[PDB]
């Protein structure tokens, strides 16, 4: 393609839309464009103006209080890429506190190179969770998009389903779009920064964002690295030189930018290493005839005179006026309000400085993890001091850990004194490494180093404690260490001993139940030498624990603190007999089947081998043989001074073969082959170790009885009689051999041909003495005799009527 449009430098538009008419024939912008403070505007004023002609906007695009703009799809259709050589509080796009926006509609920002996006207080704006920033942006942990219409309400984000590409963010897929009338153009994963076309093919590797034709340097829309006359190239050829990291210009462009600055009203553009830069660096000299930074005769530094003696470093927009400085003629107050890291950028931005002429002051910062971003910072001069003649200053630094590494990075302090205040992850050994490096031990006075506050959240004692003797047992672990002595022997205030439980291995350092440990007594001997130790009490089987020991010194006011610390060692413990497997339900689903169900016990105590199940046929009781149940009343079952005397005295020291089953790893059991309607006692246990001796539990006991059988109480076979001389009927019958336990009652329905039902019970001793039953003194005729039996469960059924005839003695 070609690029219709001129160069168009950076505009600020204020009060009205009448100054937006000078962005008419524009394609590229070497600058930043600011739309700020629009008040007397309508939503009808924005739909009759748009800019499709613009492609390249470098630095940032600032938006602040435009009244009545509604969506930005009808202003900027075809804007491609944000470079961000300069930034805006390290954000590249900022829409802040803005009136009547409800959709973005920016469907053509494929890439934003350096920085982030902060959109906050746009309270009418929907469509935020339907934009994945991580295709476009690089670091999406430093975006700050909050307090809009989508999180203060639940306004609708309707999508073109009937078609957008859907991408997972954490664990579910939502569609990616901009409006309800657009879908987001998503490149494939081969087309990473090479761009994708409209049919989904990869372009040239120097194409960025969009291409018209695939695999072509001439047919990109925006370049990745450098633009030269329709093409996307990696570098310039000669005689062309680089300009603002995006285009190749000649000597006639870069020569006249000197001549509009030197001869007129600044950015005097010079050339070094074929790059049209506004400044020569240090050790690099502007000559008179050519424009080249030639290398210097001496040191030749860059004394950066700051405005008002001090520059407050707050982001990289503040830190990009110090790149290429070597000598700062002033002071730096670094004040970074945290939540975002900045140490990747600030090593690239700062860290070429050497001397600070004034003071140095880190104050009220949160996320600043070191001062290793200063790479070549050697001398603090202190010509214009912090007030009260100080030069170094530290206050409320929350995550500040290391001041410096001490290989070659020396810190010469000429004038002024130190401070440290309330910094909890920076101990006094690094504060002593100011004093052994700078030579400033004999300069400071009292509370110029605060001592109690600085470093009370990290293990910083830098000698070694070692354990000397570990003896383990069941709930008691004997720990012993070797005693650390400070070189005053009253300066050991004691120890504390930290222990914590751990199922897995990697436990983080410095949850931690604290015991207070006394210091021991010496004889000043190295012969016995009094290894102190502490033993822990009373804690569960089969759990590893993570235990470490750290000292506690009596604090000397003058010198270093003292201490030693150990690494964390791991003691695992052993086990015992386990607990009761709870809630046993015996299910008598059949007349011979008993189904048991149970659970694991409360103490597991190792890898459990089996569950030991005992059972036994209980014989029934001897009172049920000899109960007269023809006497009525027939309701049957349906089914510390023993401690105290020893411790006072301690302080003057001054088979029967039952069946069983080893139920290995199964929590249910059926019992087969039993006597029907019989009491059984069922004993269960739990064993965690059996073949290297049986470590089994205590027992729980279940009484159970089966279902009855129907034919066990049913009278089979012949039933016969004897007719005596005076009409006495003596009855013979035979029992079933198996009962349902035993049968308690027998009854008879003796019936004549036409008479009524008459009742007689036969008990156990009425059966056993009469060999059956006897009837005496009868009215003669035809008879119909039917017998039931009634067991402990219940009734058996009737027999057939037996038809016979006793003698009448009348006819």
């Amino acid at each position: 393609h070609l690029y219709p449009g001129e160069v168009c430098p950076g505009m600020d538009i204020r009060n009205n839309l009448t100054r937006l008419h000078e962005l008419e024939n524009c394609s590229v912008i070497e600058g930043h464009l600011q739309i700020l403070l629009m008040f007397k505007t309508r939503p009808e004023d924005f739909r009759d103006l748009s800019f499709p002609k613009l492609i390249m906007i470098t630095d940032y695009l600032l938006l602040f209080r435009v009244y009545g703009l509604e969506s930005l799809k009808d202003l900027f259709p075809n804007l491609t890429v944000i470079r961000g050589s300069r930034l805006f509080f390290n954000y590249a796009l900022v829409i802040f506190e803005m009136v009547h926006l409800k959709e973005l509609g920016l469907y053509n920002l494929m890439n934003i190179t350096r920085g982030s996006v902060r959109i906050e207080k746009n309270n009418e704006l929907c469509y935020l969770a339907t934009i994945d920033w991580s295709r476009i942006l690089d670091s999406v942990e430093d975006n700050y998009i909050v307090l809009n219409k989508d999180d203060n309400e639940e306004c609708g984000d309707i999508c073109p389903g009937t078609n957008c590409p859907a991408t997972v963010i954490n664990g579910q897929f939502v569609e990616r779009c901009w409006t309800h009338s657009h879908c987001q153009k998503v490149c494939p994963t081969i087309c990473k920064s090479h761009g994708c076309t409209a049919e989904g093919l990869c372009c040239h590797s120097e194409c960025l964002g969009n291409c018209s034709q695939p695999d072509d340097p001439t047919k990109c829309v925006a370049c990745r690295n450098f633009y030269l006359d329709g093409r996307c190239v990696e570098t310039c050829p000669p005689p062309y030189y680089h300009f603002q990291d995006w285009r190749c210009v000649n000597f006639s462009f870069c020569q006249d930018l000197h001549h509009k600055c030197k001869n007129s009203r600044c950015h005097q553009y010079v050339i070094h290493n074929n790059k049209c830069i506004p400044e020569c660096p240090s050790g690099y000299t502007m000559n008179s005839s050519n424009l080249l930074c030639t290398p210097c005769l001496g040191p030749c530094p860059k004394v950066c005179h700051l405005l008002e003696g001090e520059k407050t470093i707050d982001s990289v927009t503040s830190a990009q006026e110090l790149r290429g400085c070597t000598v700062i003629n002033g002071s730096l107050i670094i004040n970074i309000r945290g939540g975002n890291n900045l140490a990747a950028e600030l090593e690239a931005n700062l860290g070429l400085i050497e001397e600070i002429s004034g003071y140095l002051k880190i104050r009220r910062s949160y996320a600043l993890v070191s001062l290793s971003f200063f790479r070549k910072l050697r001398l603090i001069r202190g010509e214009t001091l912090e007030i009260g003649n100080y030069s170094f200053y530290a206050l409320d630094n929350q995550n500040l850990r290391q001041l410096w590494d001490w290989s070659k990075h020396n810190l010469t302090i000429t004038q002024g004194k130190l401070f440290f205040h309330y910094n909890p992850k920076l101990c006094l050994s690094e504060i002593h490494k100011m004093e052994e490096v700078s030579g400033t031990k004999g300069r400071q006075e009292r509370n110029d180093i605060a001592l109690k506050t600085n470093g009370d959240q990290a293990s910083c004692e830098n000698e070694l404690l070692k354990f000397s003797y570990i003896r383990t047992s069941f709930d008691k672990i004997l720990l012993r260490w070797e005693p650390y002595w400070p070189p005053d022997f009253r300066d050991l205030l004691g120890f504390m001993l930290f222990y914590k439980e751990a199922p897995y291995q990697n436990v983080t350092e410095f949850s931690w139940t604290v015991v207070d440990i006394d210091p021991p007594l010496r004889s000043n001997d190295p012969k016995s030498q009094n290894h102190p130790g502490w033993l822990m009490r009373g804690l569960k089987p089969w759990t590893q624990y993570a235990i470490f020991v750290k000292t506690l010194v009596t604090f000397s006011d003058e010198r270093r603190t003292y201490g030693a610390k150990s690494d964390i060692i791991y003691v695992q413990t052993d086990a015992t007999n386990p607990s009761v497997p709870l809630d046993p339900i015996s299910v008598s689903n059949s007349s011979s089947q008993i189904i048991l169900k149970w659970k694991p016990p409360s103490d597991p105590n190792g890898n459990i081998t089996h569950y030991l199940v005992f059972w036994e046929r209980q014989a029934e009781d001897s009172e049920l043989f000899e109960l007269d149940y023809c006497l009525k009343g027939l309701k049957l079952p349906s089914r510390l001074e023993e401690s105290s005397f020893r411790k006072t005295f301690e302080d003057y020291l001054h088979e029967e073969h039952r069946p069983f089953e080893k139920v290995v790893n199964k929590e249910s059991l059926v019992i087969s082959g039993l006597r029907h309607f019989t009491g059984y006692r069922i004993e269960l246990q739990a064993c965690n170790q059996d073949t290297p001796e049986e470590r089994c539990s205590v027992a729980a006991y279940v009484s159970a009885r089966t279902m009855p059988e129907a034919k066990a109480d049913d009278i089979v076979g012949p039933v016969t009689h004897e007719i005596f001389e005076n009409n006495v009927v003596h009855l013979m019958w035979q029992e079933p051999k198996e009962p349902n336990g035993l049968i308690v009652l027998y009854e008879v329905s003796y019936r004549r041909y036409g008479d009524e039902e008459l009742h007689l019970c036969v008990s156990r001793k009425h059966f056993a003495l009469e060999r059956g039953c006897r009837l005496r003194g009868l009215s003669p005729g035809n008879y119909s005799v039917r017998i039931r039996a009634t067991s402990l469960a219940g009734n058996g059924s009737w027999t057939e009527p037996t038809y016979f005839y006793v003698t009448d003695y009348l006819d």
Binding site: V515, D518, P532, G533, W534, K647, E650
Partner: peptide
């Protein structure tokens, strides 16, 4: 007279190490 020390709190190990010295 030990469970007003060793059951109300935990007694330290040189006390009960000297009780081991007085035992054996």
């Amino acid at each position: 007279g030990i469970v007003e020390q060793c059951c109300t709190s935990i007694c330290s190990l040189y006390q009960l190490e000297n009780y081991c010295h007085s035992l054996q």
